[PDB]
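Posting here for the record, re: sodium ion.
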Amino acid sequence: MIQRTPKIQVYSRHPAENGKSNFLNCYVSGFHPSDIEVDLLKNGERIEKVEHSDLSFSKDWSFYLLYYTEFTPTEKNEYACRVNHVTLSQPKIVKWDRDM
Ligand code: NA
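Prediction output follows.
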């Protein structure tokens, strides 16, 4: 068995084809087992509609999830990603790194 805690990165990207669009991305990388729960949060509340959840694996024991959706961030809200995984004794909430 192997278990590896996800790395979690929360960042925004504008698709170049539509710079008015902005995606909130939670990139959950390098984890095993694959079992995982990942939410984007706005002011602590899970964003229910997350348009994209792209899961891949490299080695059989390393999974990668890009969980992302369009958003329109303002300064008045806090955006984050919450991940639960067996490696994490508590849900990990990672705030949007507005510089990343
Ligand atoms: Na957890």
